[PDB]
């Protein structure tokens, strides 16, 4: 086509979606990880995760307001990944990298799994 | 913070949100423009437009499944802007620039209004 493009548009959209999350505006699901609860937008979860994409395209699960993750999933690992989904920023540290990689493999977030494997290989 | 960042994350999120729109997955509103109907995600509309942000933060309008725009709004101008919201790409042409600018002013999409003013000033 003959379209023009606004370079910062995608980043600005994601920044506004994170503002809506922080104010709990139009969130339509709660993700339960052990005792911890995380509110989010189903569309953002699907856009970032192969696991949520599969869950919310299912004709029965698409209507659930609560999703319980596998009890092996660490709430901190999930929190770091949910923050990444809404910001593009990953808080990867020596003390959390194993829990982050395991959570990203479960959530099917291929690019996060890739950087975790590389950071572990370096050490 | 000490975060790392994935450069293509925001663009990849927006690409997946457009894939959901094209398949009509988790769309939660219909925007009526004269005789024409456009399905979309309220969160994406809010993230892109000052008008939709105001509408869907309203305690009564947040629950509406149908929004009717002002009859002066051109369906083609709206279609081009909805495509821009989900792609960052604007199909700006000599034959549509006046309808696109008028629709962007109504929708409160400041960056689109700015490029339309500049393109009109050049001609």
């Amino acid at each position: 086509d003959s379209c023009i493009q606004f370079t910062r548009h995608a980043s600005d959209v994601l920044l506004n979606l994170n503002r809506l999350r922080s104010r709990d505006i139009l969130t339509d699901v709660v993700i339960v990880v052990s005792r911890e609860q995380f509110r989010a937008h189903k569309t953002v979860l699907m856009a970032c995760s192969g696991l949520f994409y599969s869950i919310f395209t299912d004709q029965l699960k698409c209507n659930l307001s609560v999703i319980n993750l596998d009890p092996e999933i660490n709430p901190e690992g999930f929190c770091i990944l949910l923050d990444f989904m809404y910001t593009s920023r990953l808080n990867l540290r020596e003390g959390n990298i194993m829990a982050v990689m395991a959570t990203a493999m479960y959530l099917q977030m291929e690019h996060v799994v890739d950087t975790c494997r590389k950071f572990i290989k370096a050490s | 913070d000490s975060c790392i960042q994935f450069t293509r994350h925001a663009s990849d999120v927006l690409l997946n949100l457009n894939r959901l729109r094209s398949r009509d997955i988790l769309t939660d509103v219909v925007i009526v423009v004269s005789r024409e109907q456009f399905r979309a995600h309220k969160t994406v509309l809010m993230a892109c437009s000052g008008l939709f942000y105001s509408i869907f933060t309203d305690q009564l309008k947040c629950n509406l499944s149908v929004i009717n725009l002002d009859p002066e709004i051109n369906p083609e101008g709206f279609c081009i802007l909805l495509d821009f919201m989900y792609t960052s790409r604007l199909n700006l042409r000599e034959g549509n620039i006046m309808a696109v600018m008028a629709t962007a002013m109504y929708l409160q999409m400041e960056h689109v209004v700015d490029t339309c003013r500049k393109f009109i000033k050049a001609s």
Partner: peptide
């Protein structure tokens, strides 16, 4: 704005 750019030419993509």
């Amino acid at each position: 704005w750019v030419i993509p």
